[PDB]
Design a protein around this ligand. Structure first.
Ligand code: HEM
Ligand code: HEM
Ligand code: HEM
Ligand code: HEM
Ligand code: HEM
Lengths: 242, 242, 242, 242, 242
């Protein structure tokens, strides 16, 4: 059976990110049909609970790319697909147009490992989030240029150490997670963040804009997906006028 | 009730900018439904008056990106979202397609502070708008390249002094406001202007095109949002044939 | 009140260019409904005759960007908006989707004045169009890179003298008008041409491609709007099957 | 009747290329409505037979840009427009969305003339197509960068001689026609090919990719339009389920 | 009846790749119409079995570009078109919007041939897939810059040898097929992969990102099409809620 804490903290897990706009004729449906949408959403999540985990987020009003985001994990990529196929059959899903959908895999540390960069690795492992419960999500797709990948392992390691040094301080108020996507999407990475403090988040990304690694980005957003963390019930009720 | 002056003049405020096109079938609604739209807009703005302020602008006819613009402020990012969610549930909102939606935060001065640049700071602080009441809004999203951000604080200060020296004169007939967006949108900044004098505004932007800072812009518009300042009542009536 | 000759020949005039596609369901309306459209167009133009002038052009079949173009002038930018708001309320307008809308202002000569460049200015001043009445319009939005604007006044003057030298001969065959748009649209200029001779026009633009100024263009079309000059009556009848 | 052979083989002729998608609701129309489409197409082509010639091609299934292509020639650009206006008012036309529409003019040889390049000109003039009747069409819009146009006539001639030398051999199985578009569309040229042998065509374009001229292309496709040559009757019946 | 193994393993075969989104109103159709779709799909595949082969893949939930992919082969390009024209006439086809459609031809080895690169060719020739049956498909369109094509045959061979050396090891768990598209689509190549191991596939693409060839890519995806391999019956049933 699928265990949430394990799926969120181990290598080899597929993360499937999808954003949707609600079609204009959804709100033209009868109120009873929309009232029932929330229970249909919970049933489809529950149907797939032995294979996948699902998180929901409200993006309407915080960007033009979408109205909501789904983050789905499984050790089986096709299982994420099957969940999303069934989601699209729900009442809300049927009235949802997909606007972005990126997949990636979690991996062991390539750079800031105990073996390769022990001091920074220690700071990474010892950090503790100490703020209020996160309220916001940010997803940033990232793609690096050919020049980056053609640099040596040693050159890249140095640039990732420079990425890490000024950002460790933000682990008190930003949670991060990295997925790897080269060959599976038009991105090298999907980056995922949770925070209560968007002022801090803006400062964190400014810090990263200022390092030489940033000279290699050909995608660093587009979209930058900003949303609020919501339960599935609240999300679907909100989008259904319920 | 949220204090408008405080929200417009203090540092940690979220600005939420959204532009919409009105769908073709809105004007096919019965006249009674369109007549009721202005009061619905007033009620939703009223509902959220404890947490947000709202400004409306008519962009139809002055660009192809949108028909209207909303600028929403709050100290709580999610409160701006909640207002926009409720806006979208109004009759006009139901028939509105979002075309752009950018958010940012207000900050203390990074460069032209009393400490760092006292003469320019004094000129900035003492400037007074003296023209007739503004009639037009311009919103310009801005994003700077990695080379900009990788420059030193001193190198960047010098370029911002050069931005400021030739433009202080325009504070007699252009009002300006800066928001910071890196990590929250696909922009580093949202810039907001009010004026009665678009000839002056064109000259102002030409002056800024001519300085070295401009060599670093990867976004400087796209869209350049141009509109007229309108009350919410007049905006909604105009778009409703009322 | 508005005077066509004054508005077309003086500095400080706003030019508002807008292109539209006619939605497919317009032609599904009964002929009697479409028959009324032409009179409505003339009435809205007449309603605004004290503040604006209006020209109409048919673009269907000469590009994929639009079916028609409106060029509207006024000394008040908001008056151009008011006209287009009312245009959108007409039968044809309500079935029109805007595809591009750019505004700009007419200005005194910056470069090829008698003061700064007397020989070329004499050629500009003495040229006379001497072909048949123009049949075609071309609108070309232009934007120049930061490197252009960062060049000195003298460097830019030389490049504009090189723009002018090989093109003066085409004033026999082509009428031109320049508008300035930096800060008001995602363009530095809107350029407007009338001609009966598209062979000559092609040769003219080839001559401009060959000069060093052209190395600074980041927009030089996109869209290149090509149309035929038509009365408002003929335009609306044509798009209405009448 | 217009002289087809003359329009296809002389300078100063306008070529008008347009591609369209058939709307999803076309095939929902009653069969009797669709059955009438083919004769309507024939009638509009006949109506304009004094001023224009028309060729039809099926692109559905060979690219995502369009379902069909029209190639229209006339010595009067406005006459090509008039035909396309009337085409759009036909049953199939009313259910067609234009996706690309580019115009250009045929010209005398600029480079590989008897004057400038007599050996290659002789090769060009004496070449004969000798393969199976063409079955396929390819249209490739081309635009060259400012650096190309800024090169001297002599520099450009050399590069075009290098274009021509390795491609003359393909005149046995590829028919070519060049149109000039600068100023009339977002392209410098429209290039048109007919062949039965797409393997040969692929090899021809690879040969051209390999020459220094290709370093100057900023458009070389986008779209690359690939279709099959069809009669108007077969084209319309195919797209109408008849 | 076309010979599938021959079409999949010989030079001179046309590959036609198309992706589609299912329109929102498909699921609004009565159940009986959707239940009939799978047989209609099998009938059209059977109708064309003398000339083409067809493979089907489910892409919904693994990217935002499409809901399904068709890969069609024939020695006659027009036969692939004829199949796709009849596909679009089926119930599912009629409710499908094409999102990408690229064609190409299979060719003999240009670089890693026995004559040009015998050691690497031997490794290519001896390599055997030995993992579990593939479950996933990846399609990556590739286009190389003018600088690549302008390099000599020897220079390009060296870069393709470097492509091949680190990737031979993946032939145990990734199946590959190359098609050539210059002149036939806005791509130089279409690349096609089958695997059960997306972790391996990500590592494979990372290896290729790191070589100098990658500095020449102007397209390497866009879209990167990720799907699951499915029978036609299962594909159509899944998209029909059956
Ligand atoms: C919140 C504080 C942050 C910390 C402490 C941090 C730390 C790290 C570390 C340690 C790695 C290396 C992983 C490995 O060895 O495989 C890494 C990789 C990465 N980080 Fe961050 N990061 C943070 C925020 C961000 C943000 C905000 C973004 C994007 C905007 C980002 C984008 C990435 C990317 C794309 C990689 C992969 C780099 C590569 O493999 O080339 N990080 N980060
Ligand atoms: C109206 C007269 C103008 C004046 C006096 C002016 C002045 C300034 C000043 C003093 C700052 C520095 C803020 C700080 O220290 O943090 C600044 C920043 C900025 N201004 Fe302006 N400005 C004007 C117009 C404009 C216009 C028209 C634009 C856009 C077209 C613009 C875009 C910006 C941007 C993007 C920043 C942030 C720069 C950075 O942090 O890298 N400004 N401006
Ligand atoms: C028809 C013959 C043409 C002549 C004689 C001509 C002449 C001129 C002159 C004298 C100026 C300088 C105006 C000033 O001093 O402020 C100018 C500016 C300009 N022209 Fe033309 N022009 C012609 C055609 C065109 C065409 C076809 C285009 C675009 C394709 C074009 C684009 C522009 C632009 C963008 C400017 C503004 C340049 C700047 O301020 O940096 N012109 N032209
Ligand atoms: C089929 C064999 C081909 C031959 C023999 C051939 C030959 C030529 C010749 C002789 C010219 C010069 C015309 C002049 O002097 O004005 C020319 C121009 C041109 N050709 Fe081709 N060509 C062939 C195929 C192609 C293809 C496949 C393309 C596009 C992919 C192409 C694109 C062009 C363009 C854009 C020009 C105009 C160049 C300029 O004026 O700068 N040609 N070709
Ligand atoms: C799975 C292991 C892989 C192996 C062993 C491999 C091997 C090869 C070989 C031997 C060639 C030369 C074909 C010839 O001589 O004509 C080739 C060409 C090519 N491969 Fe791969 N490849 C693999 C994976 C990939 C992947 C994953 C991609 C794309 C992301 C890719 C893209 C290409 C392209 C575009 C070409 C044509 C290059 C050109 O002609 O310039 N390959 N590959």
């Amino acid at each position: 059976m699928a265990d949430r804490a394990k799926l969120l903290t181990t290598p080899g897990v597929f993360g499937n990110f999808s954003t949707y706009k609600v079609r204009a004729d959804y709100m033209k449906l009868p109120a009873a049909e929309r009232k029932a949408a929330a229970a249909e959403a919970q049933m489809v999540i529950d149907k797939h609970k032995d294979k996948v985990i699902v998180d929901t987020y409200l993006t309407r009003g915080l960007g033009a790319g979408s109205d909501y985001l789904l983050r789905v994990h499984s050790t089986d990529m096709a299982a994420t697909q099957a969940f999303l196929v069934d989601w699209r059959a729900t009442k809300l899903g049927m009235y949802s147009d997909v606007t972005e959908n990126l997949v990636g895999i979690t991996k062991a540390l390539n750079y800031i490992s105990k073996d390769k960069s022990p001091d920074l690795n220690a700071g990474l492992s010892s950090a503790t989030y100490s703020d209020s419960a996160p309220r916001y999500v940010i997803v940033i797709p990232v793609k690096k240029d050919a020049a980056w990948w053609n640099m040596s392992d040693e050159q890249r390691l140095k640039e990732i150490e420079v990425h890490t040094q000024p950002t460790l301080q933000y682990l008190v108020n930003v949670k991060r997670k990295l997925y790897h996507s080269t060959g599976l999407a038009d991105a090298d990475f999907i980056t995922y963040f949770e925070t209560a403090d968007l002022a801090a988040f803006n400062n964190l990304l400014i810090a990263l804009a200022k390092v030489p690694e940033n000279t290699h980005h050909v995608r660093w957003g587009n979209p930058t997906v900003l949303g609020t963390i919501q339960s599935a019930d609240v999300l679907v009720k909100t989008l259904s006028g319920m």
